[PDB]
Structures are given as C-alpha cells and as structure tokens.
Write a protein that binds this ligand. Structure first.
Ligand SMILES: Nc1ccn([C@@H]2O[C@H](COP(=O)(O)OP(=O)(O)OP(=O)(O)O)[C@@H](O)[C@H]2O)c(=O)n1
Ligand SMILES: [Mn+2]
Ligand SMILES: [Mn+2]
Length: 330
C-alpha cells in the first residue's frame, strides 16, 4: 500500500521499474505536446507510482491496489510485460510529430507553443530553423548555436567546477553571500540538462544588485556565452563556457536570487522534482487550504503568510513527514 500524493511518499533516485516508467513518460510527454494536460498528469502520476515501488513489476498482479493506475496505464504495462513492447509507445517514438516536438522543445528558450507553431508552419529540422532567423529570439539563436553541447548531459564533475566559479564570483562581489545547488543535482542525480543555483545573503536586502556584479565577474573571465537578466525572483538564465582538459563545453546554468525570508520556499520550489512540486502544491491547496509557491505559503481565508526558517518548517506546517531532496524524485 502506498499514499496518493507523491509528497506523502519517498521516491528515490534509482528504482526497479525504469523500462515501465520510461514508456509511461513517453506517453505523458506526447500528451503535453498535443496540449492534453490532463492525460500528461495522469501518465506522470502512474510513472511516479512505479518509481516508488520496492520491487520490479514482473507480472500484472503486482499492479493490484495502487493509486493513480487507471485502465490506460495498466494496458501499457500489460503489453510491455507480455510482449516486451507497447504498440502505442513505439508508434509515438517513430512519429514525425513527436520526434520534431522533442527536437524543438529541447532547444534552449523553446516551449511547446513555439515548437507546435513551428511544426504547423512546416519546420522540421534545426537547419530549417537556422534558415529562418527572423523567427527566432536571441535566446533561441543561442540555443541553436550551442545545441550539440546543450544536448550532452551535464555531469556532476561539471557541476562541481561551475559551483566553484559561481561561489568565487559571489564571494568576491559580496562577502557573506551564499550559493546553494538546487534542481536535480540536489536530489542526487548524476546528470542533468542544466545546473540550478539559488543565491542569498543572511541580511535581508544585502542581495540587492548582487547578480549583475556576479555576472560582470563571470563575463570578464570568459565564462559566459549567453546571459539574459530578468528583474518573481531576480534571475539570470545563462549559457556558461566550461573549460575542460583540451577543449570546452557550453552548459546551461540558472542563477536565482532570493531574499533570505523567502529562501526556504525558493529552495523547496527549485529543488523539485517538477512533479513532486506540483503534487506538494495540490496537496497544500486541496488537503490544507493553503496556497504554496516558490515565494511563500499563503492562507487565503486569513490573508497570512507562513514564516519558515527551513524546508522542514514547511513540511511540518503542511502536516507532512519530511522528505530529504534525494527522496523527492517523483
Ligand atoms: N522558470 C522555472 C524553471 C524551473 N523551475 C523549477 O525549478 C526546478 C528545476 O528545474 P529543472 O532544472 O528544469 O529541473 P531538474 O529537476 O533540475 O531537471 P534536469 O536534471 O533535467 O535539469 C523544478 O522544480 C522546476 O519546477 C521554476 O520554478 N521556474
Ligand atoms: Mn536542473
Ligand atoms: Mn533550470
């Protein structure tokens, strides 16, 4: 037996049902490409159930008594168990629509609505996009310029080198300022599509104007290929030029600044997983009547914000057993 919400159960990094969860996640992703948001969430939830199981699913009897495991997801697993392959999944994999939407949406700065628009307009390849530079934002141009490197999984060794240059720049700009690794790497992942950092300072307001100083420092060291600064939290969505022995690699890096009062909420929100956070927010609203986001936890009946010093505070306030980041891999 297993609880309904992903935020009520530990989901570890490595599990016993990777083939099955991957097939369900293909169907979820394809659903999102078609704007089918309900079906996306349903497949995502079913995949995350399999990730939380203690043993491999070898036979269909193992499905018994699991939440969020409807007829469709059951059917998928059934064909995988009996036939080694699911027809619907293979047809999605082979389809030009899926392949092209995956190609485009992978690009830095391209979401589903942009990818779909380009698909509808007859664009198929990365060369097709480069032939129409008037259709691209400067962010997307940068994403295309570095697409091979940005398609290469980011490694822990890369994270460690990046955290060192970001920590050095932050420390030189403002002694006492801190850098915290968030995103998937905080959850224990060995690889990622980017590196996520959250920056703050223990005195509220001392973080003002810190990010542009950090970026100047990084730029003057040759480490920045692309930067877009947005005054929501202050953030810079970047492409770093990471030196490596004999060469270099472009790597996506998100730098987020939060005032220390909001840091616990920001750390929780940015640590993920995306599904875990969606589930945590749904749980907070539906079960506790509170609205959770990356800035705070709001009681809409009382018009009050919860004061939290830590993630542990937020879990406790919501009536949830604490899950460390490595158990949030929903
Ligand atoms: N503009 C954004 C981008 C991301 N996030 C959140 O930040 C976390 C990290 O996002 P991302 O790097 O996409 O996820 P990872 O789990 O780090 O995945 P990967 O290993 O692919 O980088 C997630 O909880 C996501 O919901 C957010 O709140 N606002
Ligand atoms: Mn990430
Ligand atoms: Mn990110």
């Amino acid at each position: 037996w297993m609880p309904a919400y992903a935020c009520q159960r530990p989901t570890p990094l490595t599990h016993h049902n990777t083939g099955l969860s991957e097939a369900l996640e293909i169907l979820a992703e394809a659903a999102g490409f078609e704007g089918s948001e309900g079906r996306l969430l349903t497949f995502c939830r079913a995949a995350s159930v399999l990730k939380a199981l203690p043993s491999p699913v070898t036979t269909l009897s193992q499905l018994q008594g699991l939440p969020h495991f409807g007829e469709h997801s059951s059917r998928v697993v059934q064909e995988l168990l009996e036939h080694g392959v699911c027809e619907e999944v293979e047809r999605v994999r082979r389809s030009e629509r899926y392949q092209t939407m995956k190609l485009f949406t992978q690009i830095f700065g391209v979401g589903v609505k942009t990818a779909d628009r380009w698909y509808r307009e007859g664009l198929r390849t990365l060369d097709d996009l480069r032939e129409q530079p008037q259709k691209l934002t400067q962010q997307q141009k940068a994403g295309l310029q570095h697409h091979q490197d940005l398609s290469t999984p980011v490694l822990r060794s890369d994270v460690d080198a990046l955290q060192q240059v970001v920590e050095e720049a932050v420390g030189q700009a403002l002694p006492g300022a801190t850098v915290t690794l968030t995103g998937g790497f905080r959850r224990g992942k060995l690889q990622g599509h980017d590196v996520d950092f959250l920056i703050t300072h223990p005195k509220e307001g001392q973080e003002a104007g810190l990010l542009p100083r950090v970026m100047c420092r990084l730029q003057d060291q040759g480490l920045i290929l692309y930067h877009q600064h947005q005054h929501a939290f202050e953030r810079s969505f970047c492409i770093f030029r990471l030196p490596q022995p004999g060469s270099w690699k472009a790597v996506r890096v998100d730098l987020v600044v939060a005032p220390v009062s909001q840091f616990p909420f920001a750390l929780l929100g940015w640590t993920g997983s995306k599904l875990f956070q969606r589930e945590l927010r749904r749980f907070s609203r539906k079960e506790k009547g509170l609205w959770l986001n990356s800035h705070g936890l709001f009681d809409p009946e009382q018009k009050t914000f919860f004061q939290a010093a830590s993630e542990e505070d937020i879990f406790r306030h919501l009536g949830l057993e604490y899950l460390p980041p490595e158990q949030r891999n929903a």
